[PDB]
Design a protein around this nucleic acid. Structure first.
Lengths: 198, 32, 130, 48, 122
RNA sequence: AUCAGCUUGUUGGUGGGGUGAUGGCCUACCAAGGCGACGACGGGUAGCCGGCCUGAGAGGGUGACCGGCCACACUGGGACUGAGAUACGGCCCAGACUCCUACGGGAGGCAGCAGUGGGGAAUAUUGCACAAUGGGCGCAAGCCUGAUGCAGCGACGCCGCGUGAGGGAUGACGGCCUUCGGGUUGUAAACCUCUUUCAGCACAGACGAAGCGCAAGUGACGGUAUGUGCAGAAGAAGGACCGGCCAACUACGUGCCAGCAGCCGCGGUAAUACGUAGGGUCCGAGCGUUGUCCGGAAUUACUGGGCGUAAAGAGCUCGUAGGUGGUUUGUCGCGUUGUUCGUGAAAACUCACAGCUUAACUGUGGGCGUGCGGGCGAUACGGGCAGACUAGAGUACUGCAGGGGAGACUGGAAUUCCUGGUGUAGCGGUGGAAUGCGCAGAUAUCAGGAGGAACACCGGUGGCGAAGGCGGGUCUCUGGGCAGUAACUGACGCUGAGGAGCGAAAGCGUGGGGAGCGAACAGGAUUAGAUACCCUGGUAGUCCACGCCGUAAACGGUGGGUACUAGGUGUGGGUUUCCUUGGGAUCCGUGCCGUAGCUAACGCAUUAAGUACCCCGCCUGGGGAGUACGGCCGCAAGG
RNA sequence: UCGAAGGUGGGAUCGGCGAUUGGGACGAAGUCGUAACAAGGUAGCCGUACCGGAAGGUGCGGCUGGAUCA
């Protein structure tokens, strides 16, 4: 990924809507032996997302690096994924496993900061979280820890969803501090939203 | 798995057996 | 047969994982109290106690959602024989951030984590379900 | 956290020989009555 | 595993794995140097490495490497050996301090400057 | 436990003795215990703690300062004095050492504060005061105090401040790159105002003392801190690093050299990795290196790991301690839990506040002190005791299947030899041959005899056994399994550290037996050469009796038990409902395919590697090495 | 009576050195072969026994982590 700063007198750079947040996690040239030598190709693990908390995971195969990055962008574009939150935190401590990828995603009080390793830091920095506390146990990789983090975010659910599963009136599903954090986060959603209307 | 591990182990074992052939006598008498 | 309640919750994880409608069990007192707690929190739908070969039996129907999806998203026996886990009042261990619940058998009977918090008594855990 | 069952071979003092093997005796701590005989037993509960 | 098996016996750490046997848990030891011969490393790295084997005060016989361009030390110099690591010659894991008791600092060294012991230009 | 037994004042009793006090503390007698796989007795190391460091915590490391206990005072014994003794600057004795001696005999004791030598990578002055606080004696004054208070020394640590500020160009001199245009150093510099902390020189000069004192004075630190003045940018910056991780790049110089490096790895005349230069980055009175510890390391995994093939399931069972325990009524309150009392010194730690120009620092008030003991309460769960139950477990009864085992007797086909026929020159063997047996009568064929071993066909993805393993037949003795009824007992269950037993083949001992096969051992051939394959011969062995040994890819590479989790189709054992052998249903077994789920992947998949509980074994990078040393078993090989 | 040191005695146990010797690790490159990986040119491996300059070879039983398919 070099020589991107450019000014063209051509038709268009085609800049348009959906200015999302896009992170390229790792690139390892992938070789293939054929008759008389090696054929080098490229893999780019592409994270895309918006600051609401919708995450994509794309996996680009091409024999050029920006081609593989662009194919990962289109593949994560094809496949988004909804993550439920509280304010800008996570709901409750989970462990995700993608066959060797263990990631523990635990919430924290706000202000602490996204503390995670670089793959999980990528998937969570694209997402709508600002203050959680994760760790990547096992598998020491990028692909399995990204995919394990997304499986960990599939083990998430709303407080309300849990209440619904059990047919119980909330209050009765959460404890009270987390309901107060719901009041804080929806209150600042009201303040920034009504400042957004004017 | 592979048989290479098995064969390294067995090389050690063989060498040792031989070493006890040749020193058999000597170990008996030097020990007695 | 070494742990009764592990076979109970084990049979609920298997019958929950394999999309079953009901389940049948050897009835006992402690399984009746756990079945009554999981009634009162709504993780299972309802249980009925039959008479059968020699003893009574516990037939639990499981509560599913708007399609085939499950309400009990897991069980885990923690106060297991060999490491029976005890809990003072300071912390009735919170489960799944509070969204899950903790079946805690205090001196007043069998309670949940929240009931062990407000009523001011602790003294066990048992399995906690989310 | 394993609740370990442990034993303790204390030594104890019967003046009247009221206890025998297998009994459920009480104990109470005393003055050091000899080299590790630091217990005397009152109100023996059950005999064998 | 089967927690009563850990109540019986289990779960101890492995081994301290001591790095240097200079002695005493001491950072550098002065030493009488003998036979300052120059060696040949492993196969991807071919050169001549300027080692000297040193009898540390701690009575042990070791073999240290002399960093820098050349060595002021001849036979029977009082060199101050610290512990290091040179991959390249097997069994030599100690480095002689340059700019020390006997062995003078490296001359015209102008950039590295703390290692190799070159004093500042007047 | 590569230390399994130790102990004879040793274990208890009585009478004395001793002590401030209980007591094998001591003694006489009597009794003969006591302590140990919850590790006794031995070996190694070590002062212990409040704490400190690290860590999300759990935990790991450590025991410096400060504080609390303990032990010792040249080495080793002993008492005396005294309210109280390891009696550091006491005594007595014996040692080792230093010293004085008129040679008769004496003297010493820094592990007090300084200080010297030595050892060492390394650790300070032979300081000044009792003004303050503590201590002693004294009616008091007062005297003593290397405790203490302070000072000196070392960037040894932690914190604070300084080495100037503001202006200043289409950006000078110089430097080094360059695409030869220029670009960087660089607003930085020179210059122009301004301000001076801190060092400098002046003069003033403390608090610490609501103190002591009956004397009139008294502060070691101290003419220090600190004030108010004067002069002037005036006296004040360095060290590492710039391949990757990991903020930061260019040229020149050497071109597998000289060197670098924490790991990966850089040097073979165009190195952003070596050396020098510019330039950048990061820190800053410091900055790098080495050592030691925690972290990252979920890499000893309680929290928080594993064992089909990656390291890892004992060859297989039986069973001692141990761990663990179905249904249900009562009782106890040992585990658990609630509450209150006591305690966890101070300091530290954390929160708030106050004090020093700020901070480090210090103080005040909370919390912490995760614990332990006493009182009172609760009884679900665990446990104890006392009971009850029949589903687990075992027994009885009726059957049923089977190379389960041992002993005994016996059967035929085939190979070899033997005697006798019939009968001749080849047979045997090979990729091709030759050693070899023959021509003395072989191989071939017929009749008879000996002797040994193995059991064609049935017989296979089939049966039985715990695992090894088990197939000619019959008889004798004996072991287990399965189903059916439910007659009995009433939780008697599960696992099982050590332990005993069984355990292919090879091998070992003593005595038999010895047909075939056959290591070793010959010859032949092949080959460069065969100490090999292939050929001809061939001893131990293979066989039986009696014992050893204890190993295997002893493999399902899968410890044992239990409950549950879509199915489909074979086959083995047995009960029953229906068609009337067919189908169904059921309990136990063994295969092939297959969902869910699981796995690193292959795969597994109701006979789990799925979901859970109980107990055991075992693993912690590869070699070194299942080896040395030591012990145990063994006739030895060896385990 | 007890009793420190001293003396005599025979042992335990921890080490240091020892001529010679066994193996082990590394070295580049030397000599000798070619055992293993493809049916590796005789399928490999386990146990054990015997033999051989060496890798190894053979026997007895086992195993697929074996092959092509009579």
């Amino acid at each position: 990924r070099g020589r991107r700063d450019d000014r063209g007198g051509r038709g268009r750079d085609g800049g348009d809507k959906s200015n999302y947040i896009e992170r390229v996690v790792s690139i390892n040239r992938v070789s293939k032996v054929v008759k008389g030598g090696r054929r080098f190709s490229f893999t780019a693990l592409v994270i895309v997302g918006d600051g609401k908390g919708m995450v994509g995971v794309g996996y680009g195969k091409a024999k050029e690096v920006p081609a593989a990055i662009a194919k990962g962008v289109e593949e994560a574009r094809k496949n988004f994924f909804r993550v439920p939150l509280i304010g800008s935190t996570i709901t409750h401590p989970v462990q995700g496993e993608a066959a060797a990828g263990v990631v523990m995603l635990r919430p924290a009080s706000p202000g602490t900061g996204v503390i995670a390793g670089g793959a999980a830091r990528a998937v969570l920095e694209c997402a709508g979280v600002h203050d959680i506390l994760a760790k990547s146990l096992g598998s020491d990789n990028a692909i399995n820890v990204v995919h394990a983090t997304v499986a960990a975010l599939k083990l998430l659910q709303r407080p309300e969803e849990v209440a619904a599963r059990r047919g119980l009136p909330i209050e009765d599903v959460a404890p009270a501090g987390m309901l107060k954090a719901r009041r804080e986060s929806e209150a600042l959603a009201a303040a920034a939203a009504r400042e957004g209307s004017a | 798995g592979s048989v290479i591990k098995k064969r390294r182990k067995r090389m050690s074992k063989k060498k040792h057996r031989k070493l006890l052939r040749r020193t058999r006598v000597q170990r008996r008498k030097l020990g007695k | 047969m070494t742990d009764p309640i592990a076979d109970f919750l084990t049979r609920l994880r298997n019958a929950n994982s394999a999309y079953h409608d009901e389940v049948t069990l050897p009835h006992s007192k402690l399984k009746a109290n756990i079945a009554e707690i999981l009634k009162r929190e709504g993780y299972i739908s309802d249980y009925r106690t039959e008479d059968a070969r020699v003893g009574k039996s516990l037939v639990v129907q499981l509560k599913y959602g708007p399609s085939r999806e499950r309400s009990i998203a897991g069980l885990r026996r923690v106060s297991k024989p060999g490491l029976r886990v005890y809990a003072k009042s300071t912390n009735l261990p919170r489960v799944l951030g509070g969204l899950g619940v903790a079946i805690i058998s205090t001196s007043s009977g069998l309670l949940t984590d929240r009931q062990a918090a407000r009523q001011g008594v602790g003294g066990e855990v048992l399995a906690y379900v989310w | 956290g394993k609740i370990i069952r442990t034993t303790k071979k204390v030594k104890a003092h019967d003046e009247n020989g009221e206890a025998g093997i297998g009994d459920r005796v009480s104990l109470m701590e005393t003055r050091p009555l000899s080299a590790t005989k630091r217990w005397r037993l009152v109100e023996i509960l059950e005999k064998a | 595993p089967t927690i009563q098996q850990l109540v019986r016996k289990g779960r101890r750490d492995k081994i301290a794995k001591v790095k240097t046997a200079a002695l005493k848990g001491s950072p550098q030891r002065r030493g009488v140097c003998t036979r300052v011969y120059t060696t040949t490393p492993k196969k991807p790295n071919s050169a001549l490495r300027k080692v000297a084997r040193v009898k540390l005060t701690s009575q042990v016989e070791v073999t240290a490497y002399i960093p820098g361009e050349g060595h002021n030390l001849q036979e029977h110099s009082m060199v101050l050996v610290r512990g290091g690591r040179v991959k390249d010659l097997p069994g030599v894991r100690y480095k002689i301090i340059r700019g020390s008791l006997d062995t003078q600092g490296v001359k015209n060294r102008k950039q590295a400057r703390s290692r190799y012991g070159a004093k500042k230009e007047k």
